[PDB]
Amino acid sequence: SMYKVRDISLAEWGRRELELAENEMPGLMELRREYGPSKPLKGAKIAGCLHMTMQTAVLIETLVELGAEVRWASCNIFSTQDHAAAAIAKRGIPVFAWKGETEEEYMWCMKQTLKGFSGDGYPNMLLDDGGDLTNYVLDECELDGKIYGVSEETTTGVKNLYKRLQRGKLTIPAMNVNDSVTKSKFDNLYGCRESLVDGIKRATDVMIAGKTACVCGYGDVGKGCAAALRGFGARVVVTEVDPINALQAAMEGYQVLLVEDVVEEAHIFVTTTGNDDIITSEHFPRMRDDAIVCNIGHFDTEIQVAWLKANAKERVEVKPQVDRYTMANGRHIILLAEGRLVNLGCASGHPSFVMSNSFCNQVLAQIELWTNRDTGKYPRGAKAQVYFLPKKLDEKVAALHLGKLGAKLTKLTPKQAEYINCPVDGPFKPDHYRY
Amino acid sequence: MYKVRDISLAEWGRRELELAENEMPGLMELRREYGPSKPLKGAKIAGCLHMTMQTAVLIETLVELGAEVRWASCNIFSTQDHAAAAIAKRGIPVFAWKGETEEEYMWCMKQTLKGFSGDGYPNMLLDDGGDLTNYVLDECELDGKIYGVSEETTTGVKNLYKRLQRGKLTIPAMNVNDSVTKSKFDNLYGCRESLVDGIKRATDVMIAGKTACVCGYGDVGKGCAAALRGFGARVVVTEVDPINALQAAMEGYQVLLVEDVVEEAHIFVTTTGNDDIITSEHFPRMRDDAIVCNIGHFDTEIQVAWLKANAKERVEVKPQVDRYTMANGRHIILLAEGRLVNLGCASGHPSFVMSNSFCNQVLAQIELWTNRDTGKYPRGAKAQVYFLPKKLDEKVAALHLGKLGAKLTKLTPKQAEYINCPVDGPFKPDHYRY
Amino acid sequence: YKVRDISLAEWGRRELELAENEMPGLMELRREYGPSKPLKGAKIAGCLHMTMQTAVLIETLVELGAEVRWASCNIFSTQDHAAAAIAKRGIPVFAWKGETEEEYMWCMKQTLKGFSGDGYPNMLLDDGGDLTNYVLDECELDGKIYGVSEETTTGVKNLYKRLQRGKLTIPAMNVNDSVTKSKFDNLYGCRESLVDGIKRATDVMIAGKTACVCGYGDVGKGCAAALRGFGARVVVTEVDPINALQAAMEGYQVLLVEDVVEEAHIFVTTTGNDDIITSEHFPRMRDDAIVCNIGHFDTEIQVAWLKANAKERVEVKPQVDRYTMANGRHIILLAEGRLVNLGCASGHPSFVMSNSFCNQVLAQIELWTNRDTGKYPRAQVYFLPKKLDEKVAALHLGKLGAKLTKLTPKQAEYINCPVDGPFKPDHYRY
Amino acid sequence: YGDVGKGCAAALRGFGARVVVTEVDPINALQAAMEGYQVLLVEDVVEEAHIFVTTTGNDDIITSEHFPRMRDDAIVCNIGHFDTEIQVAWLKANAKERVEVKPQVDRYTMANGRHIILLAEGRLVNLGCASGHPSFVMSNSFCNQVLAQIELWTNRDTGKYPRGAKAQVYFLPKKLDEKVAALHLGKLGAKLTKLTPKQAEYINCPVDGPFKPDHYRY
Numbered sequence A: 001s002m003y004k005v006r007d008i009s010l011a012e013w014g015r016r017e018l019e020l021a022e023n024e025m026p027g028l029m030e031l032r033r034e035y036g037p038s039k040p041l042k043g044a045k046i047a048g049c050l051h052m053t054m055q056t057a058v059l060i061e062t063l064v065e066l067g068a069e070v071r072w073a074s075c076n077i078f079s080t081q082d083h084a085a086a087a088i089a090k091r092g093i094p095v096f097a098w099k100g101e102t103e104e105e106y107m108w109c110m111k112q113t114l115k116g117f118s119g120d121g122y123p124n125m126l127l128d129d130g131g132d133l134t135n136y137v138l139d140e141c142e143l144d145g146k147i148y149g150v151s152e153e154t155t156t157g158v159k160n161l162y163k164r165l166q167r168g169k170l171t172i173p174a175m176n177v178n179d180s181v182t183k184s185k186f187d188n189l190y191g192c193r194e195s196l197v198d199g200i201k202r203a204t205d206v207m208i209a210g211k212t213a214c215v216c217g218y219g220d221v222g223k224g225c226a227a228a229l230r231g232f233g234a235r236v237v238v239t240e241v242d243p244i245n246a247l248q249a250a251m252e253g254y255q256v257l258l259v260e261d262v263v264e265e266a267h268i269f270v271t272t273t274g275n276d277d278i279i280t281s282e283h284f285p286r287m288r289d290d291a292i293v294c295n296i297g298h299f300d301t302e303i304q305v306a307w308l309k310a311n312a313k314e315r316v317e318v319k320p321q322v323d324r325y326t327m328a329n330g331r332h333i334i335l336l337a338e339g340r341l342v343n344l345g346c347a348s349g350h351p352s353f354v355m356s357n358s359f360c361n362q363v364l365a366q367i368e369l370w371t372n373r374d375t376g377k378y379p380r381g382a383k384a385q386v387y388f389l390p391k392k393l394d395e396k397v398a399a400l401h402l403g404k405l406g407a408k409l410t411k412l413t414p415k416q417a418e419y420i421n422c423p424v425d426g427p428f429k430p431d432h433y434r435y
Numbered sequence B: 001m002y003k004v005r006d007i008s009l010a011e012w013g014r015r016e017l018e019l020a021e022n023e024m025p026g027l028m029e030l031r032r033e034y035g036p037s038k039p040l041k042g043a044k045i046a047g048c049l050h051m052t053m054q055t056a057v058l059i060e061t062l063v064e065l066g067a068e069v070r071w072a073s074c075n076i077f078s079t080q081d082h083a084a085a086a087i088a089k090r091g092i093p094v095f096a097w098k099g100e101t102e103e104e105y106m107w108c109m110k111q112t113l114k115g116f117s118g119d120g121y122p123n124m125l126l127d128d129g130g131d132l133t134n135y136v137l138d139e140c141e142l143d144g145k146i147y148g149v150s151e152e153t154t155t156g157v158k159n160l161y162k163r164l165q166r167g168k169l170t171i172p173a174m175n176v177n178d179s180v181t182k183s184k185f186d187n188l189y190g191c192r193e194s195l196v197d198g199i200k201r202a203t204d205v206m207i208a209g210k211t212a213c214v215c216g217y218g219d220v221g222k223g224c225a226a227a228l229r230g231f232g233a234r235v236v237v238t239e240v241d242p243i244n245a246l247q248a249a250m251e252g253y254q255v256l257l258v259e260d261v262v263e264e265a266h267i268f269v270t271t272t273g274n275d276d277i278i279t280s281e282h283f284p285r286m287r288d289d290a291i292v293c294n295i296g297h298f299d300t301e302i303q304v305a306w307l308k309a310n311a312k313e314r315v316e317v318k319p320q321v322d323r324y325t326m327a328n329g330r331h332i333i334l335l336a337e338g339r340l341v342n343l344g345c346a347s348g349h350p351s352f353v354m355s356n357s358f359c360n361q362v363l364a365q366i367e368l369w370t371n372r373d374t375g376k377y378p379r380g381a382k383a384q385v386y387f388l389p390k391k392l393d394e395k396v397a398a399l400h401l402g403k404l405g406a407k408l409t410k411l412t413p414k415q416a417e418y419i420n421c422p423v424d425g426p427f428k429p430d431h432y433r434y
Numbered sequence C: 001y002k003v004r005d006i007s008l009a010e011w012g013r014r015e016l017e018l019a020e021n022e023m024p025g026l027m028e029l030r031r032e033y034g035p036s037k038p039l040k041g042a043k044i045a046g047c048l049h050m051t052m053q054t055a056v057l058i059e060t061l062v063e064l065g066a067e068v069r070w071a072s073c074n075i076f077s078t079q080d081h082a083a084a085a086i087a088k089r090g091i092p093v094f095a096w097k098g099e100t101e102e103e104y105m106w107c108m109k110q111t112l113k114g115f116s117g118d119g120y121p122n123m124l125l126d127d128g129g130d131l132t133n134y135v136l137d138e139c140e141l142d143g144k145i146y147g148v149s150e151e152t153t154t155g156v157k158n159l160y161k162r163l164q165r166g167k168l169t170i171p172a173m174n175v176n177d178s179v180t181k182s183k184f185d186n187l188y189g190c191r192e193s194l195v196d197g198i199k200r201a202t203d204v205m206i207a208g209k210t211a212c213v214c215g216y217g218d219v220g221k222g223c224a225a226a227l228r229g230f231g232a233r234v235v236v237t238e239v240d241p242i243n244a245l246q247a248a249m250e251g252y253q254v255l256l257v258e259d260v261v262e263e264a265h266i267f268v269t270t271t272g273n274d275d276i277i278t279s280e281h282f283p284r285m286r287d288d289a290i291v292c293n294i295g296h297f298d299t300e301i302q303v304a305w306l307k308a309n310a311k312e313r314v315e316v317k318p319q320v321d322r323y324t325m326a327n328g329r330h331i332i333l334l335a336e337g338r339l340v341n342l343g344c345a346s347g348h349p350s351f352v353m354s355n356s357f358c359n360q361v362l363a364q365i366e367l368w369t370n371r372d373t374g375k376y377p378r379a380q381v382y383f384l385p386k387k388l389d390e391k392v393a394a395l396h397l398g399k400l401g402a403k404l405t406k407l408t409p410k411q412a413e414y415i416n417c418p419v420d421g422p423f424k425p426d427h428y429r430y
Numbered sequence D: 001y002g003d004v005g006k007g008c009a010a011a012l013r014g015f016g017a018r019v020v021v022t023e024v025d026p027i028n029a030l031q032a033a034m035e036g037y038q039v040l041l042v043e044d045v046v047e048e049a050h051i052f053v054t055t056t057g058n059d060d061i062i063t064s065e066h067f068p069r070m071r072d073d074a075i076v077c078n079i080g081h082f083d084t085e086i087q088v089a090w091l092k093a094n095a096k097e098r099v100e101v102k103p104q105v106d107r108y109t110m111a112n113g114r115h116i117i118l119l120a121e122g123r124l125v126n127l128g129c130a131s132g133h134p135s136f137v138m139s140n141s142f143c144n145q146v147l148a149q150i151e152l153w154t155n156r157d158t159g160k161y162p163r164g165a166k167a168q169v170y171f172l173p174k175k176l177d178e179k180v181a182a183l184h185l186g187k188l189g190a191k192l193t194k195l196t197p198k199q200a201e202y203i204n205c206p207v208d209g210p211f212k213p214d215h216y217r218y
């Protein structure tokens, strides 16, 4: 079993869309030109677990152009774009992904990426979005000194890396790609500002203008989500546990309250926290009729979906990933993607341009970890650690995306560079800079 | 013992000081929390920071905490004379007036370095821009007499890192600008309100419909662009950092070079903390009655000397608003002689956001002073720059939520373990950018 | 394995019982580190004179958990009962007294295969640099070596030449330049083992003779001292004015080989350099002049020329060749120019070799334990930390009954070190 | 048993003294043992030793614990830079009689009735009771001093030897160290061998030096 996708006949359609996506990903395409001839990932055997979308297809073929062997699976049961998976599969890249996996199928798909490489069959690098692959490899398979690095995409996965580290259970160097400035401050923020509403609208065609929306969390994701809804004329309320994030939201003109303060009136609920049990059994029974409930954090357990399913009197699939529940009170709740990431589960995830930032960081992480396997710069012992990309490379990634937009950079004079204490070519900011 | 423009302005200052205190919940809460235990007893603070109504609340907070204090402004045009008068009337030594000469500015500063109790020297510095710090460390001897400095602004903190790296930092420095509750609030939201306030009090120009060039897209330029854009200006941004550049572009601003818009822009605002942004290359190309202003810490972002030397006419329209006639016949309106326009032409940032900044200053001074005999903040060659702990940054934010009616959700123990923090915080890892 | 005679295992086991009692330091590392096994995982390729002293080193490494494969780093330095004992114990050894140049080469290549896994070594332990040269220039081990520890001045000289040339890929710990090696082994070791080699070889009287010692480094200092201790009049040659002033200040004439070549009864070369005793010297020497080398390689003496141009050569006994020159006079060459202490005797005594080999154990531990700490990137040359230098010395005081004064806190503060040291600054020369 | 102790021990032994040595450093102590000296604690020999020589550069080496145990007419002296290696203040305060035998020789009578001879009141005995080091060895020392002054003074507006915060301690370059030795070989008739180009290459140095790497201990 070398690939498993919904329908291989979708491959041509995928390949048409891949042309458009490549044009929208100038940074990834430029890394292909800059690094392809020198093949920095020759010998790398990368098992990837990341939403199998058109964007991830451009990433995958970039890794392969740089020399890597790659086997791939999605990190969510509803995020695969079947035509993208098909396009990769038809090219001969092993991909085990389809939209609408069972949890059992999900695990089978992941397992498929950890065997079947050349010469011994074992991966030697992981590329992970959410930590599921990392955990399975480190806890359940064996690969115990065979892995030279992991690059982690998302906030929840990065939190899990730091928990693993602190528990003394990180045995491979980890590159924290989420917290590249060109990742967290663009993907998490601007990607969600576009993709949340796309998810909601494709699922429900609900009017946002005039509605009351409750956005749980005001990190980078909730900042973008709040911005998106407000832009269409929703009245957005925000919940938070961090007083700094809470004060930001208030200074931007959002009411900051508890879920319970708005639960009876809000038309739309969006969870963005990366935490569990945000929308619970205490809330669902108080919601107004046809309240839309969705999640954009990494895991569905932000919402008590199992509770809803067990306690609803009726459930109607309106269309795939749109379920309308009738509660005992007679009113309805619309749950999107069974509480899975709504932008990917109900729409297409973030657009290609912002994913080019994220994936340039992933490519640069993989190069950094692989090309340094034998230098001890990123140890695999019990001393294994989490690392960030150097600021110089973060700046490179941003600069790769300015041209498409027509944005022109001023050049510091030597006198100016001296005065602000940086090189003429950067980095331009101290390491603690928050942008 | 003090020197201010007019002591009869004291009563007016004290009226407005009531309003300001009420807008500064966090500072007033620090007064209540720390006042009885007098954590700054024995502290002798020389302050160099814009002598505004907001700074008056800071100063009296430091005094309520047990500090002796002597104060000067860190800009020749930023003093609010009724604020200075209210402080001076209470017997706090202040040497500050709006419209100082550079010579007077230096005399004011020097007055803060003498005249304390018993021996008469300061033992702590509180600076905004680094001018006091440089003067003390390079030009005085107060050598070994100073236990700390807390620094307010990006330009001053940059200079601290330069000194540190030159091996010329000999006192512990608290980087207050780079507290999250400072840089992401004062620099951003304070400028978002006070930039346009400055421009409007100076000129009454309509913002709507104009083309504005915002030079720099840091915390200050983000706020400034946001402000102009909210009133209907078409904002263009310049930057040297590709990350900042991409943020501006993703927010819907054109990112270009000064040269690309110099002929058409109605308003230029420099926000860089760098020099020679608006130059001799530019002024001769500007449209008639282009407004030129700076909100960065020092006026040398704009070549004002060149402007003055090369203009054919200069008319003071009203104080801090000068209209220059160039050889080409057209006019440039320069605000505050290129000094910080929010403070020079208006009142600076509003009290509420300054309460964040100045809570950080008070907690920084407490931290340095109470720890003087502990070795935690070494003086001498091993002197470093420090940030306030995240727990304190979060405390500052929390102090300001109630005024606004913002309510915080409380994590359950389960949730707290899951996100790898304590129920009471800190809630974010040290590298978090907010 | 490959040794001369495995039935000499019994005799070697008996001497190793005496060697063990003379090496308190190595036996004390065996007790301290054996329980925790800090070289577990370690796959040591070894290239160091296969003596009784190295046998106690090899068994320490294996007690510490390491797998080990060994070859001697000189053709005539092996002690055949030493190799026979290690070979019986199950340790793979390829070493006999009197290897040809072909055979010497084969033995080294044996140590780079036959580990577990596709078991290529992950560590090197070197004396002279030859193994380091072979692995780096000619083997494939490119991704596989975490370090090399280098025992001698000549081998270390190469490591610095490589680092300089941008060709050092594996981290190197300079063991020779530990104080407890260079100022002990090189010095006191040679002070006893040089005359041992000469006398076992020739039975010649030292007292009354004129001896030319060429070079006055740590080895030259020791040899001159030894010869002088027996009533030789020693003259010294040097290219370094500092070393020359030291020899002059100790009572020795410093001159050129040519100034004494016609009258010297004994020539010793200690330089680590080539062509010290050459075709221009040999025909000038007095009858039965004894010529030998105690430097790493034999090419301090032009032995090929000697062999090419002698009228007669006679083997008095193994490693003692008596040449008759064109002039009718004779030259007695020892060990064919090979290290004379190891070639004609047993090398340095155990007690001093315990200082050196402790350094080698703590160097291997340091390199290998930090093999996933990123402290020695796979590339620089390093020193053992002075703390461990002092430890080595401290381990050897007890056997001699030496007692160490303990610093008070006042005293340690006053001389600017911890009560338990390091006691000297990093540049101290002892 | 540093450089001073090494010399002092070699001198005493050279005249037929049995020399015992004290040390706090295991390396220096082992050097002393391997040169044939007993290494023991001052307490181990305080009652039997005829001569006590202080060479540590450390204070409180010979103390109130030692003085009252010393044999009759035990000679006590110091050659390290400061006299406080010996508790002379104590000796003076607790002795029952002091006689100047001659300048820089004080004979003290202890409460036990036995005598202590102290040299130069504990000051550097070589300079205090004699003329210090001979000229020839001081020529080495003082050549480095002249070279040092030239290095620092001539390069004063250079930044090679930074002022203030970043001031640091330096050694003379090894080339100059060699120069000084070379200047003293002639008087002694010491002849130096000249490396050939191949020899210098093989050893990895210049023909004219420096000949050793900077870590070399000679």
Ligand SMILES: NC(=O)c1ccc[n+]([C@@H]2O[C@H](COP(=O)([O-])OP(=O)(O)OC[C@H]3O[C@@H](n4cnc5c(N)ncnc54)[C@H](O)[C@@H]3O)[C@@H](O)[C@H]2O)c1
Pocket: A154, A155, A156, A157, A187, A188, A216, A217, A218, A219, A220, A221, A222, A239, A240, A241, A242, A245, A272, A273, A274, A275, A278, A296, A297, A298, A299, A341, A342, A343, A344, A349, A350, B409, B410, B411, B415, B419, B427
């Ligand atoms: N769907 C996507 O395309 C996508 C993209 C980026 C990130 N993510 C995921 O989205 C989530 C959010 O990421 P982020 O970068 O914004 O994280 P973040 O840490 O910046 O922000 C989350 C916020 O939630 C707050 N919070 C935690 N528990 C809360 C609770 N009980 N109630 C209210 N607020 C609470 C925190 O204080 C924080 O400010 C993560 O799970 C991340 O992996 C998803």
Ligand SMILES: NC(=O)c1ccc[n+]([C@@H]2O[C@H](COP(=O)([O-])OP(=O)(O)OC[C@H]3O[C@@H](n4cnc5c(N)ncnc54)[C@H](O)[C@@H]3O)[C@@H](O)[C@H]2O)c1
Pocket: A410, A411, A412, A416, A420, A428, B153, B154, B155, B156, B183, B186, B187, B191, B215, B216, B217, B218, B219, B220, B221, B238, B239, B240, B241, B244, B271, B272, B273, B274, B277, B295, B296, B297, B298, B340, B341, B342, B343, B348, B349
């Ligand atoms: N007026 C006020 O009330 C007030 C308030 C806060 C800060 N400040 C001051 O304002 C200034 C800016 O502070 P900040 O926090 O935004 O700093 P910042 O470092 O965050 O941003 C300044 C930006 O200018 C950019 N830049 C530098 N040189 C440039 C040039 N030649 N052309 C275009 N862009 C350039 C940098 O890349 C950077 O992003 C500083 O001088 C600071 O001390 C003033």
Ligand SMILES: NC(=O)c1ccc[n+]([C@@H]2O[C@H](COP(=O)([O-])OP(=O)(O)OC[C@H]3O[C@@H](n4cnc5c(N)ncnc54)[C@H](O)[C@@H]3O)[C@@H](O)[C@H]2O)c1
Pocket: C152, C153, C154, C155, C185, C186, C189, C214, C215, C216, C217, C218, C219, C220, C237, C238, C239, C240, C243, C270, C271, C272, C273, C276, C294, C295, C296, C297, C339, C340, C341, C342, C347, C348, D193, D195, D199, D203, D211
């Ligand atoms: N046989 C043994 O058991 C044993 C033990 C230790 C070291 N060694 C070896 O002995 C040799 C010397 O070691 P070391 O520690 O004394 O080295 P070292 O560098 O301290 O001493 C060598 C000396 O020879 C001098 N020299 C170089 N070329 C010369 C020339 N052509 N004429 C006169 N003098 C010259 C140098 O100035 C130097 O002082 C090295 O090859 C080392 O590997 C052998």
Ligand SMILES: NC(=O)c1ccc[n+]([C@@H]2O[C@H](COP(=O)([O-])OP(=O)(O)OC[C@H]3O[C@@H](n4cnc5c(N)ncnc54)[C@H](O)[C@@H]3O)[C@@H](O)[C@H]2O)c1
Pocket: C405, C407, C411, C415, C423, D001, D002, D003, D004, D005, D022, D023, D024, D025, D028, D055, D056, D057, D058, D061, D079, D080, D081, D082, D124, D125, D126, D127, D132, D133
């Ligand atoms: N008198 C002279 O003409 C002259 C000449 C040279 C040096 N000196 C002085 O001699 C002193 C020593 O110089 P050096 O070059 O030998 O120093 P050094 O560091 O080489 O030797 C001092 C030794 O004393 C040891 N030591 C420290 N405390 C000890 C203790 N309480 N008991 C026993 N040993 C102890 C140290 O471990 C060290 O090895 C210094 O004060 C120096 O200034 C004087």
